[PDB]
UniProtKB/Swiss-Prot annotation, chain A:
<keyword id="KW-0539">Nucleus</keyword>
<dbReference type="GO" id="GO:0045116">
    <property type="term" value="P:protein neddylation"/>
</dbReference>
<dbReference type="InterPro" id="IPR037518">
    <property type="entry name" value="MPN"/>
</dbReference>
<comment type="subunit">
    <text>Component of the CSN complex, composed of COPS1/GPS1, COPS2, COPS3, COPS4, COPS5, COPS6, COPS7 (COPS7A or COPS7B), COPS8 and COPS9 isoform 1. In the complex, it probably interacts directly with COPS2, COPS4, COPS5, COPS7 (COPS7A or COPS7B) and COPS9 isoform 1. Interacts with the translation initiation factor EIF3S6. Interacts weakly with RBX1. Directly interacts with COP1 and 14-3-3 protein sigma/SFN. Interacts with ERCC6.</text>
</comment>
<protein>
    <recommendedName>
        <fullName>COP9 signalosome complex subunit 6</fullName>
    </recommendedName>
</protein>
<dbReference type="GO" id="GO:0005737">
    <property type="term" value="C:cytoplasm"/>
</dbReference>
<feature type="domain" description="MPN">
    <location>
        <begin position="5"/>
        <end position="138"/>
    </location>
</feature>
Swiss-Prot record, chain B:
<dbReference type="InterPro" id="IPR000626">
    <property type="entry name" value="Ubiquitin-like_dom"/>
</dbReference>
<dbReference type="GO" id="GO:0150052">
    <property type="term" value="P:regulation of postsynapse assembly"/>
</dbReference>
<dbReference type="InterPro" id="IPR050158">
    <property type="entry name" value="Ubiquitin_ubiquitin-like"/>
</dbReference>
<dbReference type="GO" id="GO:0070062">
    <property type="term" value="C:extracellular exosome"/>
</dbReference>
<keyword id="KW-1017">Isopeptide bond</keyword>
<protein>
    <recommendedName>
        <fullName>Ubiquitin-like protein NEDD8</fullName>
    </recommendedName>
</protein>
<dbReference type="GO" id="GO:0030162">
    <property type="term" value="P:regulation of proteolysis"/>
</dbReference>
Curated annotation (Swiss-Prot), chain C:
<dbReference type="GO" id="GO:0008180">
    <property type="term" value="C:COP9 signalosome"/>
</dbReference>
<dbReference type="GO" id="GO:0046328">
    <property type="term" value="P:regulation of JNK cascade"/>
</dbReference>
<keyword id="KW-0378">Hydrolase</keyword>
<dbReference type="GO" id="GO:0000785">
    <property type="term" value="C:chromatin"/>
</dbReference>
<dbReference type="GO" id="GO:0051091">
    <property type="term" value="P:positive regulation of DNA-binding transcription factor activity"/>
</dbReference>
<dbReference type="GO" id="GO:2000434">
    <property type="term" value="P:regulation of protein neddylation"/>
</dbReference>
<dbReference type="InterPro" id="IPR050242">
    <property type="entry name" value="JAMM_MPN+_peptidase_M67A"/>
</dbReference>
Amino acid sequence: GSVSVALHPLVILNISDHWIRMRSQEGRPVQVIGALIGKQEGRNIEVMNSFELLSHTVEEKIIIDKEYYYTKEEQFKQVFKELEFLGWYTTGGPPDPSDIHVHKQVCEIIESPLFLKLNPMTKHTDLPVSVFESVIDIINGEATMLFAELTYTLATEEAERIGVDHVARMTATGSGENSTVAEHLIAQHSAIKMLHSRVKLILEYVKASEAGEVPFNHEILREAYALCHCLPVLSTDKFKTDFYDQCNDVGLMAYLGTITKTCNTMNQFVNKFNVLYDRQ
Amino acid sequence: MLIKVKTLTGKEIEIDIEPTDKVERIKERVEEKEGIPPQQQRLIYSGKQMNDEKTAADYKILGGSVLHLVLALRGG
Amino acid sequence: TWELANNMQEAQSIDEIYKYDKKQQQEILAAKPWTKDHHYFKYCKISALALLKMVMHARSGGNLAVMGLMLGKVDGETMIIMDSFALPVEGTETRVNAQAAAYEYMAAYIENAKQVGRLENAIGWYHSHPGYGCWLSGINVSTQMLNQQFQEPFVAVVIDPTRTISAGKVNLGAFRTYPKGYKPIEDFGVHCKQYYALEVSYFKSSLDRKLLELLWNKYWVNTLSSSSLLTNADYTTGQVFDLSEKLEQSEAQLGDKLAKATRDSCKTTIEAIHGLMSQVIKDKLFNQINI
């Protein structure tokens, strides 16, 4: 089915940085246009990096100029050798005909370009980005460029996970008055909700099989029974003793640490008291 | 005669050069004004490093195009 | 409602740091506060995007050594960096020389960024050390000498790709240097008196935070099966030891540091209680079903 798209957690950060930069510079958020670069291996397409392309406006329409891309194409060839043009990204919602018009000269530059959509105004659990492939229609007349939606993967190299965890541990939670609770108790809440959704789907399938909407597949129900019988995990005495020991240890570690915040407030109080009601 | 030099950090230099002056001469003057070492300047003119041997002969310019200076920066 | 605050368009000081106050930058540059005292900026804050770009450049270098620039600004006592930009330099894994290619590359890339809409300037440079820790060598010390003495706002960055890959944590090291004349541990090298170290911090925007949290959301199994405080025991014990040393120093001083000690203790206690809370939540969710 067409080509397999390999998306990396580096293009998205570039788009977000560009969007926030323009939003802060102009005050009123505007549309941003860039590019996508990577590798073509047979029927597989992978995206490595992304650099912005200058775009001009004429009347009300947007035009991608060729000279700036020509000058910038050989510039980054020095650092990245086996890197070639793939497509471009932009910010927006649904595919408007302006997208088709702007994609016309992209198809002129490269026969079959890819398309990336990032929607900062998303209110859904799905990935805000979307990958589209260009299709040329055969019907006579105005041959509109058709966007075929494909599947995007999350292929990553060795250093991606460690970097994202390192940056996401802090997130400057203690400077924006966002409360560390509102981060910790919320980050895993989404995972718990996802597990709830999966269990609900399994229960719905089991109920449908019981009623008779779906055929009696006498293989999935065995796995469902096995999953059912494995719910009370590790109800032994050793686990309970270890858990209680852990709880007591964390309680003591919190006591040593509350006892010093109280002491610091104590010190500040005596420092302020030694100036107001007592001379020197 | 009124050339401008802009560096990547923000320093702006205004220099006066006779059109038939040598490249070593212009480096010597710009080191006099700022304090560049005598042999460690890279000079860039319109996206092209100025060749030391090639003396400046035709400066058909009144402002606009500016030579940016950069220091040798290397590590090991 | 479930997330309460959410975000349509509102932000806070986290998103405010991404801007360019021309008048403020001009007046801090003109005033030159750090030219009067040696013990100026000690806090360096670098954005995520620059970090990943540096890491990918170092990895693409492989066993050899790479080298590139960085972009940002300075704000009061702190330094801000938010862009990485690689260079096409080659050489043996023990020495790299910037030929004319890099000289024609940095200016061209700066002009291209200015055409794009970028407004920041060069702030420093990053060099990858393949294996031999993170410390400035003699030639690095001389280069930093000349750079910080000619181009006063500057900072060097040294990372270790091999050790970062093997261990699992990054080896980011941000260094400024004491100028010549001011004279007033074998890991740091032999020029430990000439150069010193700085703390590192990171930031990300509201949009970046939302995107990172939503991307990391596809990690639920590890999220609810990690069982932290059992993997970072050594880190917490080291933190408590440093807490004890800081408390002793503060007590000696009383005979301020007490505020710093209180903040560190609060951070460690918050981490411990967060681990306990996650463990309790897991126990409630899994071990209290079907009797």
